[PDB]
Amino acid sequence: YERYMDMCCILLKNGFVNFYSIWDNVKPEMEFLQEYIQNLETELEEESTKGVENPLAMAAALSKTQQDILLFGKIKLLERLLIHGCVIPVIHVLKQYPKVLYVSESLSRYLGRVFEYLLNPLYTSMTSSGESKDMATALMITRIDNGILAHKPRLIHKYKTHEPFESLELNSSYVFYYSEWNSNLTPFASVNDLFENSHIYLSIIGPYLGRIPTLLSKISRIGVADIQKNHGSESLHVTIDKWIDYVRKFIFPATSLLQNNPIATSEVYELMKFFPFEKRYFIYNEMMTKLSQDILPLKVSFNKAEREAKSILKALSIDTIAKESRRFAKLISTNPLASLVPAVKQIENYDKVSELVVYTTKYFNDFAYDVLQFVLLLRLTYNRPAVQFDGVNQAMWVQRLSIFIAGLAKNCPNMDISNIITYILKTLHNGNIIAVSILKELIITVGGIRDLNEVNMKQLLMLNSGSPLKQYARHLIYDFRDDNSVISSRLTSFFTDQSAISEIILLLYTLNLKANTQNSHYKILSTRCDEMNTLLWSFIELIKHCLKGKAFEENV
């Protein structure tokens, strides 16, 4: 059947017979195909949404027509018509019945093959690798004969087979026989043609582009080089807007489908880095809300990732971190914005998972970082009560979330929590309790600024003297401001930009007054006023510690 189908596929492009005269008359009728399609759709949707429990030790103790449709007839004809470089029949068929792509994966791979050949010569012209093409050579066989060195080349031979992808099986190289299958196609000459033909091939391959990671990398590097080419010119914002739209519509849905493949997402984010962060948040949130639902394969992948993330999260321990950390890092780096939210909730209301997560942030790349900051702002802004139901006591999640944020600022130094600090500087205006709490924990954990509530007279005396006596006193009072100079400088640098220092000092001060003018039980009023006072004092101690010389008089 293979050779016969190949002969018909050859004949079916030199005009011997028209396509539909073959399509309409092969075995599986269109109705039986549609029935199989509905069955696959329902089974897939159920196994996605509900899910299935894989039995590990369950019950292990006490006390053919599918193969037919897949392997022959219409589907096999489509696969081969695609391999042999005749793209227009299959484009016209899949334009009508898109669901056909669910039947088998190989259609997406082969379509990606023809598209990648179409795009390769445009890709080499940019991101120039041609100057670097001259390094793919083999080592010469060296042998010592009669006490002298002798070099020889390795000898291989060439075989022709029916498999489309080339290979080299340990002595000999195999190639596709029909060596002029690429006669009817012309590669791209300019990125504009890349857009014009993306609108045809990629809109067909759909969310399944993820099945071929290499295409993601190639398109993203083309984008990076195209944006870099005109850094000087005035029209840069035009190209930025156009690539924004492109990445929104064709690539990001695809990268949402990947499976434990960090580097591809690293490339897509290396392209995304050029946008305003407003746009990145737009894309991330739309993908979260409207495109996870209402699209089948994306929904399946999101549900699989989420269930897997919860399964791993139930098994984090002080003893199993050595491998669970690597697995969680891969899973979070590949598909973050749907596998992070369960983790964010689990650390929102459980004790030690917070320390475990802050330990395992050491491993994931910039994409996981941006998405993590996103979901942090998400949770911080979700609609829910801040104070506890009982009385004026604050709820039991603010504290654990603030501890998490402080641990982030302390351990992983490539986090870029700038937007969170803009959240603080903004929402302090209205007196949000979460702002004050995050500020307190940030100052006390990262900076190391312990308060002066309980101090014996001798320590209090040493605490203002020459430098070494003061250092000994501070290390006695369990204060570690000296050893944390670098990270304190980094955080005060985050604060320095957008000139938040004076605004924050004035805000804290004029907030404690409004706290003085509220009405409640005195037993809480006195404590609140004093707590705010101590917070302000500690903040100013940090500021004087980190900003000295002229920077102080500049930004204070």
Binding site: T381, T422, K426, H429, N430, L506, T510
Partner: peptide, 26 residues
């Protein structure tokens, strides 16, 4: 978008206080 629509600036923190003098009618 809402929490990013709040106006932030030195002109708004002034919120001038009440003078110490308190008039006469836990």
């Amino acid at each position: 978008n809402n929490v990013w629509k709040i106006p932030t600036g030195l002109d708004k923190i002034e919120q001038e206080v009440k003078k110490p003098e308190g008039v006469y009618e836990i």
